[PDB]
């Protein structure tokens, strides 16, 4: 009652003070400073490889750390590991819950992870003396669909679920070590820092949060969007990230200064993004729209510099290798394509 | 087979075997009927599952040599618009609703009753952008207790703009008409209705008939004849 009202007023005045502090630190925009440099020419990218064999909608993909192998997951009920240079299939793993929504490749190449809409995150072991791929671990404890899973190291993993909660898991024991709470709506994506000490999460409440792996508490919050946050990714420097919403708009957020840096949007686009990535030098932001094709943005002037239109249905997943060699996009027509 | 070495021509054979397995395992998931089961909670879903019994919940049964796989999603409690497009290619939606609850009001909101909640959910799931060519098999449940409940207290409480003789067969027909009047497509969607109260071998036959009709139409429109 009285305490409730007084604490809500206190929260409101903290919000006002934080807004004033954020306003006082704004004196120039990215566009004004970047008005000096010169633009890059229009980018022409040609489909080199086409990867086929999935029989249903593809929902996630991840690149290996050697930039030659990748893994793809679809509602077909299979998880496939490819060879980009040659277009071969190395492994094809079945699944118990055909309602898969994520996939992840370990940074050492030993394990993979899969999960979604079944409340369980499964860890598969690829290098066995018996010659096949078998489930190494089966983490349970969420109360909502898994929407992201990223390997922190060879024996840790961070997951985000549809019950407004992120969780850190030790794969050996199988029990949560830390639980991150504070989101109001379903959490849709997360991305890890280059040093694997921080990560960011983006949820269905039009807000993003910067967590802390060690101490397990929220540190900083970023608002500004108007709909879901379907995708999120760090800048290679590790001091910024890019949010891809569902209102046909992308944004660049800065960590050291809690501000909106610059907005990517065009009036001919009325449909929301489903995937976001950067380039090795941090000059190109690739965004996967659901108007059947991808887009490339010059991430320092906010002007389009090419279109990767080669897909027949919605574009769901998208990723760039560790050395900037290629870019792979997957889509709901059950196809994957590599551009240079 | 000219540039490749001796350790690059066994990988190709391995990939061919993988492809063979993927293609041979994808002709078994297209020969079965996928049904999506929906309801209003304590509206007879459990008993309808029991009658035709052999996160997300799964069921698998067979009748007249036709594999039915039935998905129940009543334990999710997530945001429905973030996972409802996964069930885009389902053959039909089985909607179980009980008509012995027109007087019993919902516990959460004392103002409104459960029949209105069922009508809102039916309207929301019958006009969604992903289900414009998916048929709805509608089950009306617990008609035993309805007969003794209607005589004590009429259905005018649930339907204020009603005028009738307060008999069983009328009232049932009026409720059936009220539920099928919520459809807004009428050209790419048909609603099948049925009355059941713990009856055996009738529900499965009705489901089989509706599925056969849906399959016949979907076959007719793949050659243009439809």
């Amino acid at each position, epitope marked *: 009652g009285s305490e409730l009202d007084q604490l809500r007023q206190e929260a409101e005045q903290l919000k006002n003070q934080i807004r004033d502090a954020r306003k006082a630190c704004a004196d120039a925009t990215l566009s004004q400073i970047t008005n000096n440099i010169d633009p890059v020419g229009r980018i022409q990218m040609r489909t080199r490889r086409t990867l086929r064999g999935h029989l249903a909608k593809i929902y996630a993909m991840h690149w290996g750390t050697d930039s*030659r*192998l990748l893994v793809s997951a679809s509602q077909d009920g299979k998880l496939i590991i490819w*060879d980009s240079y*040659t277009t*071969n299939k*190395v*492994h094809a793993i079945p699944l118990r819950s055909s309602w898969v929504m994520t996939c992840a490749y370990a940074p050492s190449g030993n394990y993979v992870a899969c999960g979604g809409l079944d409340n369980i995150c499964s860890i598969y072991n690829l290098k066995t*003396r*018996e*010659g*096949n791929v078998r489930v190494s671990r089966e983490l349970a404890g969420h109360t909502g669909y898994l929407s992201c899973c990223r390997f922190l190291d060879d024996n840790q993993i961070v997951t985000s679920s549809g019950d407004t909660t992120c969780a850190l898991w030790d794969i050996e024991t199988g029990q949560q070590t830390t639980t991150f709470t504070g989101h109001t709506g379903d959490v849709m994506s997360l991305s890890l820092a280059p040093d694997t000490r921080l990560f960011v999460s983006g949820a269905c409440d039009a807000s993003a949060k910067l967590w802390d792996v060690r101490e397990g508490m929220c540190r900083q919050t970023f608002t500004g969007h108007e709909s879901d946050i379907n995708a999120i990714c760090f800048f290679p420097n590790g001091n910024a990230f890019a949010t891809g919403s569902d209102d046909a708009t992308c944004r660049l957020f800065d960590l050291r200064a809690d501000q909106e840096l610059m907005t990517y949007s065009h009036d001919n686009i009325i449909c929301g993004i489903t995937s976001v990535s950067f380039s090795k030098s941090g000059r190109l932001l690739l965004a996967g729209y659901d108007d059947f094709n991808c887009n490339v943005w010059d991430a320092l002037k906010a002007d389009r510099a090419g279109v990767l239109a080669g897909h027949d249905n919605r574009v769901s997943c998208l990723g760039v290798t560790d050395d900037g060699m290629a870019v792979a996009t997957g889509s709901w027509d059950s196809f994957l394509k590599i551009w240079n | 087979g000219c*540039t490749l*070495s*001796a*350790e*690059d021509k*066994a*990988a190709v*054979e*391995r990939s061919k*075997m993988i492809d063979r397995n993927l293609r041979e395992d994808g002709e078994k998931a297209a020969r079965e009927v996928k049904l999506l089961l929906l309801g209003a909670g304590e509206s007879g879903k459990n008993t309808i599952v029991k009658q035709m019994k052999i996160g997300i919940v799964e069921t698998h049964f067979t009748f007249k040599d036709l594999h039915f796989k039935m998905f129940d999603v009543g334990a999710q409690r997530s945001e429905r618009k973030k996972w409802i497009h996964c069930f885009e290619g389902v053959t039909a939606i089985i909607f179980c609703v009980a008509l012995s609850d027109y007087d019993l009001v919902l516990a959460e909101d004392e103002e409104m009753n459960r029949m209105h909640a069922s009508m809102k959910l039916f309207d929301s799931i019958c006009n969604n952008k992903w289900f414009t060519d998916t048929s709805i098999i509608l089950f009306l449940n617990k008609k035993d207790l309805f007969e003794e409940k209607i005589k004590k207290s009429p259905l005018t409480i649930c339907y204020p703009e009603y005028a009738g003789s307060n008999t069983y067969e009328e009232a049932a027909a009026y409720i059936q008409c009220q539920f099928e009047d919520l459809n807004k497509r009428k050209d790419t969607k048909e609603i099948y209705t049925h009355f059941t109260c713990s009856t055996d071998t009738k529900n499965v036959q009705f489901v089989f008939d509706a599925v056969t009709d849906v399959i016949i139409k979907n076959n007719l429109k793949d050659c243009g004849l439809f």
Partner: single-chain antibody, 232 residues
Framework: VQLVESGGGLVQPGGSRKLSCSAS????????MHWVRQAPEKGLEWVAY????????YYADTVKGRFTISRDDPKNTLFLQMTSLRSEDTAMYYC??????????????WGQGTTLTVSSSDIVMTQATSSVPVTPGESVSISCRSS???????????LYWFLQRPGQSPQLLIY???NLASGVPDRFSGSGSGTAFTLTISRLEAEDVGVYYC?????????FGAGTKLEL
């Protein structure tokens, strides 16, 4: 994981035989299989190879049309059928598994093999060394030389090194002259280029005495080197 061979024994000069190995502990249906023979007090040479799916079969020019390889996949068994026999067929036969995909390591587990006594263009891979006396605690080197380059366009060079201790079956040490097999100490290393390759041991224990073999896998037939022996 284990393979058990059986079928060997004394045979008449002109006759047949059938050797079978049973493989328990792994997925026999996805593993290519080779036979490998070793004559008494000679080096070990290669015989035949059958692939996953039983599609492709390769023989040696010495036994082509006289040996037959077959695979009973449901019951996890591998057969070799020996049709016509001569005195130079006496050996010990081993059965080696090998699985080929990007990044694998063929010739992992070597089996144990059965004896066999009978009554009575190609690459050239050479080990001019015959024996290397050595005391424990000091580094040792072994050299191998080919007749044409083993370096392919893709950059992968198909040189294999592995060791047979006295009284046991050999075990893979190094594949593609650089990669180290799983389950061996980091003391061993391999290097070289073009046609000249060298294997090195940094710290010498008393368990490393044996014979070392270098093999190429550019193209069938696979030619084994001679025996380079170490003493204490």
């Amino acid at each position: 994981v284990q393979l058990v061979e059986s079928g060997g024994g004394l045979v008449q000069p002109g006759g047949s035989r059938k050797l079978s190995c049973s493989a328990s502990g792994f997925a026999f249906s996805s593993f290519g299989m080779h036979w490998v023979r070793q004559a008494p007090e000679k080096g070990l040479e290669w015989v035949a190879y059958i692939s996953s799916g039983s599609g492709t079969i390769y023989y040696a020019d010495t036994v082509k049309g006289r040996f037959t390889i077959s695979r009973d996949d449901p019951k996890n068994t591998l057969f070799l059928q020996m049709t016509s026999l001569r005195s130079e067929d006496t050996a010990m036969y081993y059965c080696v598994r090998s699985i080929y995909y990007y990044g694998s390591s063929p010739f992992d587990f070597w089996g144990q093999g059965t004896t066999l006594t009978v009554s009575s263009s190609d690459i050239v891979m050479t080990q001019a060394t015959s024996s290397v006396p050595v005391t424990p605690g000091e580094s040792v080197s072994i050299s191998c030389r080919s007749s044409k380059s083993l370096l392919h366009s893709n950059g992968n060079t198909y040189l294999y090194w592995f060791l047979q201790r006295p009284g046991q079956s050999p075990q893979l040490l190094i594949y593609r002259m650089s990669n180290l097999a799983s389950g061996v100490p980091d003391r061993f290393s391999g290097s070289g280029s073009g046609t000249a390759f060298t294997l090195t041991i940094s710290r010498l224990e008393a368990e490393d005495v044996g014979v070392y073999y270098c093999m190429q896998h550019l193209e069938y037939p696979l030619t084994f080197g001679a025996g380079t022996k170490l003493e204490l």
